[PDB]
Design a protein around this ligand. Structure first.
Ligand SMILES: [Cl-]
Ligand SMILES: [Cl-]
Ligand SMILES: [Cl-]
Ligand SMILES: [Cl-]
Ligand SMILES: [Cl-]
Ligand SMILES: [Cl-]
Ligand SMILES: [Cl-]
Ligand SMILES: [Cl-]
Ligand SMILES: [Cl-]
Ligand SMILES: [Cl-]
Ligand SMILES: [Cl-]
Ligand SMILES: [Cl-]
Ligand code: NA
Ligand code: NA
Ligand code: NA
Ligand code: NA
Ligand code: NA
Lengths: 123, 123, 116, 120, 123, 123
């Protein structure tokens, strides 16, 4: 029974950079994993993908496609004031939101500004 | 019908253009498509993925997993003298490569340095 | 697949480099009967079965960029005995068409490439 | 650089681990025909460059037989022996007109007229 | 008859969302459109300008030039405690207020510190 | 008589920040004014606008609307390597390039990347 905090840190060890789209995906994966009691499943699958020679980025994408809750839960909406509140690297990946985005279709989260505007964070 | 230059251009126009691993993946996908006469099916799948709600980044990953040519396909090797010869948006995306790297395992290309060393560009 | 069985009969010996190459070609064939057509024609041209297998890795567009599969095992003892005389350190990014059958990766982390 | 046949064999032997294989004997065949056509330098260049390209020594040897002009229609050497039990250390029926570049290292010619071909 | 709240949201959705002077102008235009009963005129004019190929920013400036009330109306005075209360993307766009400022003359609003200093927000 | 260099700096002191859309507009206005022999009419109108209580930003936009060369003027294309070569402040207002773009309709310039992607700099 690994904690979401510890799994996050293990995944972060493999992903250089700060405030990236893939760091945001780790957060989404760990929260949703925690809330669906599937952190251990996710961790085992992450370790197994690295052992087959997958990049950590590929391993995480494979988790969003295989682990049940990621086709049960939509990309989380994150409420922020203005666009500058989005991490710098994440901003490089912002797109208009499709009607109803899926996590396994390359959408990490949706940022919603105070003015109501929504922005889809692509992987 | 479609040429590699015309498919690259279509892909580039769907991407922001900062110079990420996905940008490098456009060249990689279209070269394999050209060399193996697969550019039409790649184009068809790329457009169908977008119409399905995929982000272009995800759509490019789907190609590497669905188009039969990318099965066991090795990332191309780019020969360089030094590490600083790599674009900065790819710089924080470089890892040691597994024994026999596969594109569908999340590997865009391999940079091979003068001193014999190799760095892998993860998606 | 019975394509592998057709190839096996033309290659005397067990657990050899070319025996492993039949296994590698056939699996990557699924993941082809154009392989079977080229093989039997090469034999009729007077090729040794070994050469016929190499021609498949060279002509067929799949193998142009196809990388050898990775076989995860415990140690050097798990490698077939006749393969052990063909083992070499791996190149940066190996390809089948460049004379590499597979990569054995041990528990230790050490990798050994099987040459044709 | 004018590399000798005796020298080029040993250069190639270093890259081939073990001893008494078909690829080991292919080195001899390549260096014999290379010496007779003064092409040992273009063989050395292609063998050393092929390895630097990411090829195994075995793949590099096969490529020489397919690309170097002297190996065109070139027959494998005929080794005259008495019986099968004289062959050291695979051995298939022989096609009508065996060529090195079609994967035949040498031919064993038996005292009773039978021929066996050593495949690569 | 479109509301002030709905017209704002439409305009916001056509803008990036950083909180520049053009963001502030949305609230100013819609408040005064409400007062002049021209919210429908402004909405139709904004959409017509976008179809002509105007950037949304230029579309907003055109409203201040074309809708009569912006010839007479004062840049609204926003009372705040200190310069920190002015949004970050507006901090640079602050200028000394000219005598009797006009919106059609490129002034969005006036910030008034309880210190006494007035600061004009240029477009 | 006024030069292109002198008019740039007269306009620069009125505008805030570095690498901004309006700073780029100054360069765009002065280059086209020089090439079309209209620096003196642009300089005269800019100064008259300021004297009438216009913000410098508004005075610049007015030039693009009132000086005859801008009536049919399409924005200049600036060729760069990748999106990261665009000034940070200019990046905040990049948009798809509309068909037949015009400066007087709110487009400072067009950025064309090496990969053929074009980004329109809105004011
Ligand atoms: Cl690590
Ligand atoms: Cl676990
Ligand atoms: Cl779905
Ligand atoms: Cl083409
Ligand atoms: Cl798909
Ligand atoms: Cl990354
Ligand atoms: Cl060939
Ligand atoms: Cl080659
Ligand atoms: Cl040659
Ligand atoms: Cl007035
Ligand atoms: Cl006054
Ligand atoms: Cl027009
Ligand atoms: Na991207
Ligand atoms: Na082309
Ligand atoms: Na023959
Ligand atoms: Na806004
Ligand atoms: Na336009």
């Amino acid at each position: 029974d690994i904690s979401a905090k510890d799994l996050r840190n293990i995944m972060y060890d493999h992903l250089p950079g700060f405030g990236t789209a893939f760091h945001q995906l780790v957060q989404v994966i760990c929260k949703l994993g925690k809330d669906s009691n599937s952190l251990d499943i996710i961790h085992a699958e992450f370790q197994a993908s690295l052992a087959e020679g997958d990049s950590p980025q590929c391993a995480l994408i494979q988790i969003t496609k295989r682990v049940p809750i990621f086709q049960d839960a939509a990309p989380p909406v994150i409420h922020i004031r203005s666009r500058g509140d989005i991490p710098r690297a994440c901003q490089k990946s912002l797109r208009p939101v499709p009607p109803s985005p899926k996590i396994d279709r390359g959408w990490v989260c949706v940022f919603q500004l105070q003015d109501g505007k929504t922005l889809g964070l692509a992987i």
